[PDB]
Amino acid sequence: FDETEIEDFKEAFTVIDQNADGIIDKDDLRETFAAMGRLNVKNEELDAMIKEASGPINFTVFLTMFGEKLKGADPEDVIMGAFKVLDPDGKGSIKKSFLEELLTTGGGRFTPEEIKNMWAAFPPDVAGNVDYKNICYVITHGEDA
Amino acid sequence: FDETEIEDFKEAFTVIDQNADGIIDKDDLRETFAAMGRLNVKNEELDAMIKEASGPINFTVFLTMFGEKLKGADPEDVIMGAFKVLDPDGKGSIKKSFLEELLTTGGGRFTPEEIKNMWAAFPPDVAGNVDYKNICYVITHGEDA
Amino acid sequence: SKAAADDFKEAFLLFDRTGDAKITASQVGDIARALGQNPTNAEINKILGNPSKEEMNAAAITFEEFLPMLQAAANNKDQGTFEDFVEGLRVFDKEGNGTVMGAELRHVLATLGEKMTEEEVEELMKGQEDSNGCINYEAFVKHIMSV
């Protein structure tokens, strides 16, 4: 965890903790979702978020919960560092079959089935290994941009 | 020591000296760490901080201890002064190999092994000598930002 | 002689990167120049070889060899006459005003005789040549003899 990433989680903690007392309760979760447009947010969704913690969601409990789910989270500059080492001549997005072979043949984390899941929402270019960069974006901030 | 840096150490001395009597004892160290989130701060850590002084930690004993550990501490504006003289055309971060050659070939403090340690937590850009400025930040205030 | 100038020994401690009080034979040319002596690089080369000293293999030094080599180079400082430096460049460009066109002095200083790198040539013209492309060598040779 770099310090600017921890400051981003402190700002997200303050936007969900609308009572500003330092502990995100279930009313803060529901009022942050209602301010984003969720008028139908069920109480069972709020209870499942609180069921991931052993205590009240203060800043260090929110940081330890996000730490334990993001144990391989990598910032965009280090993902582009590794993709610039995979394309060491610069500019070009690397081939689809080169990333499939190098993921498998180096590591068990790069096994195929997982490579079909990589192509599956990370579209073609991304999946193929040709573009580059959009995948670093969606690994640090999810969903389609 | 510029006077605003000494006022920053006076403000840090007042935040760790929660009894406000002018001497930071071991109870102040433990209660400042507990207010930052350290519930498990051992007494041996507090004893090792007090073992760096020959007497009680008043403001001048805290300033002399920090002076003797920071005998080459440089403010961010003077580090950016020197990096603007290394990049005299402005804007561009300077090359990795140019900073490795100029550190070694001018001084013994710029020897290589030390240059591998510079690249090692000061990441690539910083290490390489391309970016600039983030290294001035972390030399005046440590850890990842 | 001492006049025993002990600051030559203090400058040897500023050029020795290992702190063992020895200076390699490849640094001796530039350190004779930094002590106020301008021997040409062929002269520094000859003397070395003259004494069956090879600058091709690893070298160390001792102060006891560097002191007499600086004292053998110190007699040759009578070759530094500024009349011939300004008259050299006065024969290098037409008309009665001391101006070399930029690229004439840069290509001559890099390729004629003892090769000076184009990085060092740009560092010696920086400030004395303005955007007209004309180097005034009356002030240029004055500032080169100021160091």
Swiss-Prot record, chains A, B:
Q: Which domain of life is it from?
A: Eukaryota
Q: Does the keyword Cell inner membrane apply?
A: no
- Name assigned to this protein: Myosin regulatory light chain 11
Which residues are in the EF-hand domain?
Answer: 9-39, 74-109, 110-144
Q: Its GO biological process terms?
A: muscle contraction; skeletal muscle tissue development
GO molecular function terms noted in the UniProt entry: calcium ion binding
Q: Could you name the Gene Ontology cellular component terms for this entry?
A: cytoplasm; myosin complex
Question: Which residues of the parent chain are present?
Answer: 29 to 164 of 168
Q: What organism does the UniProt record list as the source?
A: Gallus gallus
The answer to whether UniProt assigns keyword Hydrolase to this entry is: no
From Swiss-Prot, chain C:
| GO CC annotations, alphabetized | contractile muscle fiber; myosin II complex
PTM comment text: The N-terminus is blocked.
Boundaries of every EF-hand domain copy: 7-38, 41-76, 80-115, 115-147
Q: What domain of life?
A: Eukaryota
Q: Which UniProt keywords apply?
A: Motor protein, Muscle protein, Myosin, Repeat
InterPro entries in UniProt = CALM/Myosin/TropC-like, EF-hand-dom_pair, EF_hand_dom
Please give the Gene Ontology molecular function terms for this protein: calcium ion binding
Q: What Gene3D superfamilies has UniProt attached to this entry?
A: EF-hand
PANTHER family noted in UniProt: MYOSIN LIGHT CHAIN 1, 3, MYOSIN LIGHT CHAIN 1_3, SKELETAL MUSCLE ISOFORM
Q: Summarize subunit and interaction data from the UniProt record for this chain.
A: Myosin is a hexamer of 2 heavy chains and 4 light chains.
The name on file for this protein is: Myosin light chain 3, skeletal muscle isoform
Tell me what organism the protein belongs to: Gallus gallus
